[PDB]
Amino acid sequence: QKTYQGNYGFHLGFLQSGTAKSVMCTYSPPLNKLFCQLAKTCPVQLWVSATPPAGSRVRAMAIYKKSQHMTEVVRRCPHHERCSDGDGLAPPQHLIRVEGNLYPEYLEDRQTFRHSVVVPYEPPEAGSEYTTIHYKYMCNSSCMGGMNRRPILTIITLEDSSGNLLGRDSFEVRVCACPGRDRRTEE
Ligand SMILES: [Zn+2]
């Protein structure tokens, strides 16, 4: 999926991490791919060159990477959907959750039925140049009945208060037991 920096120069950034066996979350620049453990927090940085209009919003959605699976809604496997790990906010079917935000909106498209989670866009804290949002993935890439070993992309869209696109970026995700090991192999 093509990026769209748009008028506000929107794009994502990730902390630099290694490939030690015990790392719980690690991003690969060369693959533009995040590797992470099940339900562990992933800080994703939002960068802009100009401040978006007030009331702008940030949406995250998962899609299958491969063309033959791309029309299938990404969702949790039935086992994980029933395992009672809710936070009181996220519906149990949603793969992507946000943490550390008081205003998340868990949404289902009325025509495509795809899931997403939206939070307000906030400018970077004092003496910072990015904004951070903490995402977690609630299923393994290997979940039978769910992603079933199929790679996904996370699409992050910056939207205005009317829901019009302002900017888009994306990254591949692999949710796995040993992110350190798998990044190095895939690399
Ligand atoms: Zn699962």
Give me ligand 1 centre to Cα 5, in Å: 33
Tokens of 156: 């992050």
Rounded to whole angstroms, what are the CA distances from 33 to 73, 172, 187? 20, 4, 10
Work out the burial of residue 113: count CB atoms within 10 Å of its CB; fewer than 13 is exposed, 13-18 middle, 19 or more buried: exposed
Separation between Cα atoms, residue 146 and residue 177, nearest integer Å: 16
CA of 136 to the centre of ligand 1 (A): 13
Annotated ligand binding at 176? The verdict is no
Q: Is 80 annotated as a binding residue?
A: yes
* Alpha-carbon torsion (109, 151, 154, 147), positive or negative: positive
Contact 163, 184 (CB under 8 A): no
Compute the distance from residue 135 Cα to the ligand 1 centre, in Å.
16
Protein fold of 1-187: Immunoglobulin-like (2.60.40)
Q: Given in angstroms, what resolution was this structure solved at?
A: 1.5
Ligand-binding site membership of 143 (annotated): yes
DSSP-assigned states of every residue in the chain: ---B-TTTT-EEEE------TT-SEEEETTTTEEEE-TT--EEEEEE-SSPPPTT-EEEEEEEESSGGGTTSPP---HHHHTS----SSS-TT-SEEEES-S--EEEE-TTT--EEEEEE--PPPTT-SSEEEEEEE-S-TT-TTTTTT--EEEEEEEE-TT--EEEEEEEEEEE-S-HHHHHHHH-
Which candidate, 42, 150, 56, 143, places its Cα nearest to that of 100? 42
